[PDB]
Amino acid sequence: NIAYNCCWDQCQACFNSSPDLADHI
Amino acid sequence: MQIFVKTLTGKTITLEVEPSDTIENVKAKIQDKEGIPPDQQRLIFAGKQLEDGRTLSDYNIQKESTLHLVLRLRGC
């Protein structure tokens, strides 16, 4: 399970799940 | 959290639920607040057939999201 690291400005959010990553973004 | 259900009759129906709530719970909530029985309710999201026992999180449902309730009649 790859943690989806958010490539948003200074937003280092790596979520292994699609819904959690989407919520965090 | 809030979800939006834009109906085929042009009506915008809003619900106050949680992501941990099942589709069955959202359908029951529509039943209480509008009279639309949960079985006749068909909520569609992401081209996927949403099942009652599954939760809002399984279908990637966020706050202010837009579901569509279709009158799915059992049998024909």
**Any chain A CB within 8 A of the CB of B60?**
yes
Method: cryo-EM
Give the count of beta carbons closer than 10 Å to the beta carbon of residue B3.
24
Question: Structurally, how many domains does chain B consist of?
Answer: 1
CA B7 – CA A14 distance, rounded (Å): 36
User: From the CA of B70, how many Å to the nearest CA of chain A?
Assistant: 25
Contact B69, B43 (CB under 8 A): yes
Q: Is the residue at B49 inside a domain?
A: yes
CA B26 – CA B23 distance, rounded (Å): 5
- Residue B58's domain spans which residues? 2-71
Q: Is the residue at B76 inside a domain?
A: no
Q: Is the residue at B50 inside a domain?
A: yes
User: From the CA of B57, how many Å to the nearest CA of chain A?
Assistant: 7
> Taking CA atoms, what residue in A is nearest to B59?
A19
Q: Which two tokens stand for residue A8?
A: 């948003």
> Taking CA atoms, what residue in A is nearest to B62?
A23
Residue B5 β-bridge partners: B13, B67
Angle at B65 between CA B63 and CA B69, to 5 degrees: 130
Residue B4 β-bridge partners: B14, B66
User: B67: domain CATH number?
Assistant: 3.10.20.90
Q: Is the residue at B60 inside a domain?
A: yes
Cβ neighbourhood burial of B8 (10 Å; 0-12, 13-18, 19+): exposed
Q: Would you call B26 helix, strand, or coil by DSSP?
A: helix
Structural resolution in Å: 3.5
Residues 6+ apart with CB under 8 A from B36: B27, B30, B69
